[PDB]
Amino acid sequence: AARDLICAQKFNGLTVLPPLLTDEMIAQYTSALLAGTITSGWTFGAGAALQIPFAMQMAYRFNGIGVTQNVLYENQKLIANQFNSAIGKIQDSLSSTASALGKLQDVVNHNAQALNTLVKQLSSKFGAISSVLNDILSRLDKVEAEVQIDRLITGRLQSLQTYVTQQLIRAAEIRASANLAATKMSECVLGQSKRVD
Amino acid sequence: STECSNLLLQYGSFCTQLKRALTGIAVEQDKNTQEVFAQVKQIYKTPPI
Amino acid sequence: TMSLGAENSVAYSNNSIAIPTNFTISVTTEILPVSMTKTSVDCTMYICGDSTECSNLLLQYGSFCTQLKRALTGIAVEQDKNTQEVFAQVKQIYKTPPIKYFGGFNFSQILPDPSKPSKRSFIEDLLFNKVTLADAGFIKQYGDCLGDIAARDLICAQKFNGLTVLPPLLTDEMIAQYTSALLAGTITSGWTFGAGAALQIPFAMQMAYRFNGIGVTQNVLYENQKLIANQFNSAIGKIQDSLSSTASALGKLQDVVNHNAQALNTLVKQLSSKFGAISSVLNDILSRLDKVEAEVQIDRLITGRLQSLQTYVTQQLIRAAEIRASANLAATKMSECVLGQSKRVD
Amino acid sequence: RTQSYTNSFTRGVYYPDKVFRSSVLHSTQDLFLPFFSNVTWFHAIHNPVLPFNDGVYFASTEKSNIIRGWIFGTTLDSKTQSLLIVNNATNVVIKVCEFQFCNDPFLDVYYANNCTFEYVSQPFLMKNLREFVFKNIDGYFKIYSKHTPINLGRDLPQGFSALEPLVDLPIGINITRFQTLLALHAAAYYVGYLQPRTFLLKYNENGTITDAVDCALDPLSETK
Amino acid sequence: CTLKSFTVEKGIYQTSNFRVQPTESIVRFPNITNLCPFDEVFNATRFASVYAWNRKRISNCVADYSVLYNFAPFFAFKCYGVSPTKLNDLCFTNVYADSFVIRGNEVSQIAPGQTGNIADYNYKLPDDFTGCVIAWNSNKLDSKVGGNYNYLYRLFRKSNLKPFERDISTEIYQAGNKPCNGVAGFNCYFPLRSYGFRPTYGVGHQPYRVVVLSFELLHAPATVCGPKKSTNLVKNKCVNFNFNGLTGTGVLTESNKKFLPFQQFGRDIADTTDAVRDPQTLEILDITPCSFGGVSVITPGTNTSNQVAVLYQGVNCTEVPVTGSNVFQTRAGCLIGAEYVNNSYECDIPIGAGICASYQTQTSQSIIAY
Ligand SMILES: *[C@@H]1O[C@H](CO)[C@@H](O[C@@H]2O[C@H](CO)[C@@H](O)[C@H](O)[C@H]2NC(C)=O)[C@H](O)[C@H]1NC(C)=O
Ligand SMILES: *[C@@H]1O[C@H](CO)[C@@H](O[C@@H]2O[C@H](CO)[C@@H](O)[C@H](O)[C@H]2NC(C)=O)[C@H](O)[C@H]1NC(C)=O
Ligand SMILES: *[C@@H]1O[C@H](CO)[C@@H](O[C@@H]2O[C@H](CO)[C@@H](O)[C@H](O)[C@H]2NC(C)=O)[C@H](O)[C@H]1NC(C)=O
Ligand SMILES: *[C@@H]1O[C@H](CO)[C@@H](O)[C@H](O)[C@H]1NC(C)=O
């Protein structure tokens, strides 16, 4: 009863391909990265994994930022409590506020509305006597119908070209963001960064 | 529609180069995911403790 | 189902550490596109091709031709700017001393060989041979096409239809001179030539500086100098063997060439379409039909070819933006990897 | 006659137009004989009228030159105009005159009606496989021919040999049935039917079609 | 003028390109001498009926299409694909003249893409038709008092007609379940019915004589060509050429293209004519467009000087159609107006392949390339 827009999109020749990596595989990659970071530090990114206790890894991080080891080794319980409280705060904020993932929501919405506009552009006449090809073919004969079909073809081709161009620009922007995310994973996660902010 | 298809065959290779561009975008999406996430070579797992 | 990788379990415990007792020196290869082909399009010759009626009907469509030419000229200038900002980063053309002893390190397959006409090294020659790059009609393409050859060329067809490839400002010999100067400066001075004037320093001392930079005591180098030099030489030989056997490593530059060839081929093949007219031959239309009907058919052809040209220009603009981003990355890598030592991971 | 079915083996490619193209891959769409089709081998010894459906590919490896012509039409009588091609030792004659032949028309080696067309030319026929393609398009009885030095008479060769157009007759008659002619003082010929197909034709530097791909044969050729 | 400004900044600007102009014109038509017999087509005592329309083949003659206006009194010369004015310029391989007589209501059915009784059972035109239709009233010739039943048309047929297909069989059409077996009764209709033409009917029911001239745009040698005279053959020179109605501009060169004997023209990637066969002497000629290339203007600022160098892009220096006395050969083009110096400076105005131009002193100010 509630007619889906996706059925119109599919019936008009606009399909969506599945990604190569499943969410389970993405989660497996994230689990591998997190476990390697926890159990080895930056050594697994520099080469083979080298185990080291987490307190000593925190001491290495403190020496990296310029604070001596005794600060950690005397404030270890306080630092652990602060980290746990920060994790709990992040969990509570994500459970409360639903507008945090605005960038990903926009990533979904842009493609959704682009496909919706491409589907709704089939209802325009573009100067022809009708927007229905079967109606044009049933009313007019061959010579008088070829002109109207040419008008419809030109309009729909222009709309499809506009869609392709906007998708190309959006893909370039997304690729720039993906390169930034890859750099952040390489530098922030697999090591310690001295770059400010 | 056969008449519309025969009239569309006169417009060259727009109808195929849009497909080529979309295929390029679809390939680079998986390229982006592969580059961002698959940076480690082995699947490490944490100790049970 | 695809395999993510081998399973691993790090032997983690609260009183255990793992410390390496040896090392290895690796030489990896990174390939980055910098500039793509500079092209120019004669819109009048492409759309009409020596037809006064078609030209006079095209005159009423405004400044589309002028703005397409402006965009293509901007791209052509941007390519030279990319090459300049990537390679021209050293103020003085350094040259290496005649002696070639750098503490056991060879640097024989990357330093230039003066016997060849172009002063390119062994690895540079291997790369230039592995990239299947067309001549792109540089040296008098029209004079070459004037030779009566039974097999017509695609470049000849593009030239006759009005698509011209402009030559780059910096020649390959000039690019090789920039790379040779950078190599000589790096070898003879370290990073000091990137922050002022070049300061000479023995290469063993430079590698001791590098070892102290990565957090390893310099006595490691001063006690394993011969082993480290042998490892470096073996890695260079492995790079040579990988380049002389596998040709698929240069896929990025090969794609850069292939896209610019395919775009021009598609633009040429789009001249044979009818776009709803009675024929795709302008002279056939003008000879068959009278003034008004010929004008109608010519207007249909003009609209179709103008749309095709605009599509080509838009695709080239997006491609040039991507190439410019790659060139900026390459310039940053030249500034930080070559002119200094980088602490950034991966 | 005796019928035995066999394979085409990529035979029947002809020049689709009288235009010179060299070193190019051209995509055409015309009545072609599909690759690896089911052709019929007829053995006639000293004969129902065969159908003519969207053109006929004819082949013969007969060195004795017993096969010496063709009859085309709808009913092959005096009511309907019937085309006739006859190759004797000196010339070839093509006439639309109906002879009112019997049910087994043949020529006697040992020693009419309405006539609107007549055409005389040089012998079509000289271990030599001779191939012809006949098709009626827009009132034109187009004939393509080729000769090939064959090694095995029974074996249809695996290879390419583009058929060149001999004549373009504007006969403009309704053809749905046809038959062959034998000389009597033994014969074996291959018959196949053309179909509307899209082909990819490869021209070398000399403008000769050295290779062809049938787009609808299988997914690999569709990808090609 | 290109920049739409009165002040030009320093640099290189791409100005409009240059072409080598053609010298003369060449017309090359086949050698034919006969005249096409349109008298037998138009000035005829009786045209055949539409169901048995007459067909004549016209070949190997010189056709003058402006003469047809005298033979029959018709208003216009309706044509699809061509125009009646240009018919004397281009020439065809074969011509086919079809003749019949129809009613005034059925004149509109003789057209491509048209359906109806006549277009479905008597005379069907192809949808890719390229030719002319001529129709004129014949009320003073094909009409008699009491009816002229000598003209017939087909009302009943099991199927339609293919393009240019003629039906002559007069068999009893069976419109019902029971077979007719040669008896016309109840639902057993005779397909041929007679036009009852009276002089007292309206103009819509008056007889009309129709002649359809179908042209053939084949690639076989042309046999019907107009009265345009042919000139001699000029090679290795930029000229206009007209080969059998194929008009173009370029240089005709002696070729070694192995044309098969049935091939006449040769084609390129862009479906343009690349090699032609001369209709008078059967030889193969390659067509190469006349010399062209880009033009760039290298100038300093107009605030400094008005001296200008010109770079011909893509042109060898020996191939310039023509300008200072300093001609320099670069890998990007031919530079005229800048004297090459042996020194080397920073790049002021780039040209290509390592060449840069600048307005500098000499003793005394001029444009130099280095
Ligand atoms: C540094 O700040 C931390 C909190 O940021 C202080 O820890 C708190 O100390 C008070 C009083 O001892 C306790 O009531 C809180 O529960 C502690 N918080 C946490 C998270 O443990 C710490 O005392 C401060 N240190 C100094 C020297 O002032
Ligand atoms: C560190 O690794 C190197 C290999 O890169 C070892 O050098 C090898 O040593 C063995 C035994 O002494 C020799 O047979 C090989 O020829 C050496 N290879 C090279 C390239 O010199 C080195 O011994 C290792 N160091 C330690 C302490 O084990
Ligand atoms: C640097 O590498 C080059 C190339 O491998 C070496 O030159 C070769 O040396 C071998 C023997 O060591 C000779 O047989 C070859 O004829 C040399 N030339 C070539 C082209 O292979 C060179 O000896 C190396 N130098 C150092 C210091 O290691
Ligand atoms: C340290 O590890 C051992 C075994 O891995 C475990 O028994 C012990 O409880 C750990 N230390 C603490 C403080 O939990």
Ligand SMILES: *[C@@H]1O[C@H](CO)[C@@H](O)[C@H](O)[C@H]1NC(C)=O
């Ligand atoms: C051709 O069709 C006949 C029909 O029965 C069949 O027997 C024969 O095997 C076919 N030839 C093939 C499949 O090659």
Ligand SMILES: *[C@@H]1O[C@H](CO)[C@@H](O)[C@H](O)[C@H]1NC(C)=O
């Ligand atoms: C072949 O037939 C033609 C038909 O007219 C005839 O003129 C010619 O003499 C014949 N040649 C023979 C019988 O060798």
Ligand SMILES: *[C@@H]1O[C@H](CO)[C@@H](O)[C@H](O)[C@H]1NC(C)=O
């Ligand atoms: C030959 O044509 C004439 C003229 O129409 C006709 O009377 C005669 O029956 C025809 N002979 C045939 C078809 O055998």
Ligand SMILES: *[C@@H]1O[C@H](CO)[C@@H](O)[C@H](O)[C@H]1NC(C)=O
């Ligand atoms: C064309 O034919 C000649 C001789 O017939 C031959 O030498 C040449 O190789 C051929 N060109 C090809 C096969 O491209």
Ligand SMILES: *[C@@H]1O[C@H](CO)[C@@H](O)[C@H](O)[C@H]1NC(C)=O
């Ligand atoms: C037409 O002129 C050419 C050129 O001299 C000649 O070869 C040809 O025989 C002539 N044709 C006729 C029919 O005389």
Ligand SMILES: *[C@@H]1O[C@H](CO)[C@@H](O)[C@H](O)[C@H]1NC(C)=O
């Ligand atoms: C048509 O041409 C003939 C030539 O035979 C001539 O006698 C006649 O007067 C012309 N006009 C008409 C209307 O027949």
Ligand SMILES: *[C@@H]1O[C@H](CO)[C@@H](O)[C@H](O)[C@H]1NC(C)=O
């Ligand atoms: C011509 O042959 C076709 C074959 O299907 C048939 O349908 C049609 O009725 C025939 N027409 C005539 C006039 O014989």
Ligand SMILES: *[C@@H]1O[C@H](CO)[C@@H](O)[C@H](O)[C@H]1NC(C)=O
């Ligand atoms: C220009 O023409 C000359 C003489 O024909 C020729 O030698 C030269 O190779 C051509 N090209 C250049 C770049 O000089």
